[PDB]
């Protein structure tokens, strides 16, 4: 690792600087270096890791969608042939995206998940594992697409089971996990009814627990509750 010679604390400091500068590739590289120091991550550090790679893969996904759309049009009836270039460049972006996903999944497997014993860390990492298998699923078309989808499902399911046993229904990690697993159902697993049921049940159970919260916790929970409602409105 090119970050092997840098202090852990310096890597975390520079990840925060990179965030302020909107340099998310750098941020991700710094946080990968921090993970590879081998110590567990604090709550703040876990969110630095997720923010960094979410921004990196988010841009890749947006670019892949643009290129896939152009490629699909080039393959409609009546479209002038323009050669292999659209497919090639879509493939280039796709391979880079798969590489980022594999990197994140590698960090989770070596060895963040196995050392995560508290619910807040273990659910967080298993949600990430589901998310990055979901991004692999979005571009998958081969012999292993079903296995990629089931890897996402399995990670989300383990995270869901822990979150329901160990966290209140308003916990923002529990809420965000449910939000994203619901999207997995709708967009990946061809299960819109499951997606809608999960979003609605998560929203209603959170609603009933808001009375227990401080003003600041209320703000955090209702933010994600509104995303659940937004998706329900999109889907119904």
């Amino acid at each position: 690792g090119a970050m092997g010679s840098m202090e852990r604390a310096s890597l975390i400091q520079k990840a925060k600087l990179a965030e302020q500068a909107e340099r998310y590739e750098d941020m991700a590289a710094f946080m990968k270096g921090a993970v590879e120091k081998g110590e567990e991550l604090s709550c703040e550090e876990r969110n630095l890791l997720s923010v960094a790679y979410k921004n990196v893969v988010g841009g890749q996904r947006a670019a892949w969608r643009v290129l896939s759309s152009i490629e699909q049009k080039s393959n409609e009836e009546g479209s002038e042939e323009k050669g292999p270039e659209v497919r090639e460049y879509r493939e280039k972006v796709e391979t880079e995206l798969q590489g980022v996903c594999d990197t994140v999944l590698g960090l989770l497997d070596s060895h963040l998940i196995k050392e995560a014993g508290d619910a807040e860390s273990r659910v967080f990492y298993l949600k990430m594992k589901g998310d990055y298998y979901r991004y692999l699923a979005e571009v998958a078309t081969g012999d292993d697409k079903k296995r990629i989808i089931d890897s996402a499902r399995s990670a989300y399911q383990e995270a869901m089971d822990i979150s329901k046993k160990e966290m209140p229904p308003t916990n923002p990690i529990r809420l965000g996990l449910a939000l994203n697993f619901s999207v997995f159902h709708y967009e990946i697993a061809n299960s819109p009814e499951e997606a809608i049921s999960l979003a609605k049940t998560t929203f209603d159970e959170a609603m009933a627990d808001l009375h227990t919260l401080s003003e600041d916790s209320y703000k955090d929970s209702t933010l994600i509750m509104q995303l659940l409602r937004d998706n329900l409105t999109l889907w119904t």
Binding site: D131, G176, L179, N180, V183, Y186, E187, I224, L227, D230, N231, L234, W235
Partner: peptide, 5 residues
């Protein structure tokens, strides 16, 4: 696209 976090 739908919202994820």
């Amino acid at each position: 696209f739908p919202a994820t976090v």
